[PDB]
């Protein structure tokens, strides 16, 4: 990672929290192309000092997103490790994360919007699958809306996939259980089972989010009941707008080897 000096970063408003992290809008002072000075809006992701022992996994998550370059993958600008800080500096996305956007805009998001976003997410995941690169935490909170839909210009929405955060392979078991049904059953059984098939299951859960207007699947179940949901081999209920429910369930296959390739997922989406 490129090293960014603390003196070149300004922290502004809080944008929320992730697992052992706090996120802020900020400004980065930098020399850009042609030697021009810029004050660039950035996303500042800060690892909690209490959890500094996760720094390796924290940065490895972002390293994963920068191994490859792709129009649907969030840009990392660098890191700031001055003083006692562990900070990831990323591109700032004006419209924020997709979970919040879905909850706030539930009434004006139709089937075609959901289908377009699903196709773009599947394109990003196909690129990762072709590169045999595991993401490990696909969810609407890790999808960023770059551009809103604009029917006046026919322009679709445009999304990017953000980094997965600290890996489920090192997180405490209680956090993994609270992350059911994004974390697949085989990873509840053994977090070292993390594999490309993991991301197919979590993609299914994320499509359910996209189709459910901000709702979180199984939110009414406490951790013990989420575990039993997997033990009883249940599937999620179909979203009220159920156009993608069969795809969701085919992706959330309890047999990892039976989950469809992202090429097949894309073909299915294109058939609708």
Q: Which residues bind ligand IK1 (CB under 6 A)?
A: 15-16, 23, 43, 74, 90-93, 96-97, 144, 162
**Of 89 and 245, which has the nearer Cβ to ligand IK1?**
89
Closest approach of ligand IK1 to the CB of residue 172, in Å: 21
Least Å distance, CB 156 to ligand IK1, is 20
Task: List beta partners, residue 45.
Answer: 23, 88
Which C-beta is closer to ligand IK1: that of 165 or that of 181?
165
Distances 159 to 83, 151, 252 between C-alpha atoms, Å:
34, 16, 22
Residue with nearest beta carbon to ligand IK1: 96
Q: Give min distance, CB of 198 to ligand IK1, in A.
A: 21
Quote the tokens at residue 85: 């800080």
**Distance between CA atoms of residues 109 and 144, nearest Å:** 16
Q: Cα–Cα distance between 65 and 265 in angstroms, integer?
A: 22
Tell me the residue ranges of DSSP E strands in 95-200.
143-147, 158-161
Burial class (CB in 10 A: 0-12, 13-18, 19+), 242: exposed
Least spacing, CB of residue 210 vs ligand IK1, in Å: 16
Give the rounded distance of the alpha carbon of 91 from its chain centre.
Answer: 15
Which of residues 76 and 265 has its CB atom nearest to ligand IK1 in the complex?
76
- Shortest reach from residue 144's CB to ligand IK1, in Å: 5
Strands 37-47 and 9-18: unpaired
Beta bridge partners of 160: 144
């Amino acid at each position: 990672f490129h090293k960014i000096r603390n003196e070149d970063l300004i922290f502004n408003e809080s944008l929320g929290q992730g697992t052992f992290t706090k996120i802020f809008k900020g400004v980065r002072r930098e020399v850009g192309d042609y030697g021009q000075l810029h004050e660039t809006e950035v996303l500042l992701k800060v690892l909690d000092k209490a959890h500094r022992n996760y720094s390796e996994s924290f940065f490895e998550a972002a390293s994963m997103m920068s191994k490859l370059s792709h129009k649907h993958l969030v840009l990392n600008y660098g890191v700031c490790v001055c003083g006692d800080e562990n900070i990831l500096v990323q591109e700032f996305v004006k419209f924020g994360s997709l979970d919040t956007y879905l909850k706030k805009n539930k009434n004006c998001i139709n089937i075609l919007w959901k289908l377009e976003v699903a196709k773009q997410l599947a394109a990003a995941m196909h690129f990762l699958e072709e590169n045999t690169l595991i993401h490990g935490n696909v969810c609407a909170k890790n999808i960023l809306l770059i551009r809103e839909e604009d029917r006046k210009t026919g322009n679709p929405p445009f999304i990017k996939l953000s980094d997965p955060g600290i890996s489920i392979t090192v997180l405490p078991k209680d956090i993994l259980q609270e992350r059911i049904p994004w974390v697949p059953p085989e990873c509840i059984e053994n977090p070292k089972n993390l594999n490309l098939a993991t991301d197919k299951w979590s993609f299914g859960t994320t499509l359910w989010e996209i189709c459910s207007g901000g709702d979180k699947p199984l939110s009414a179940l406490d951790s013990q009941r989420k575990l039993q949901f997997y033990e009883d081999r249940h599937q999620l209920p179909a979203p009220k707008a159920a156009e993608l429910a069969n795809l969701i369930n085919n992706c959330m296959d309890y047999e990892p080897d039976h989950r469809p390739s992202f090429r097949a997922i894309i073909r299915d989406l294109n058939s609708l």
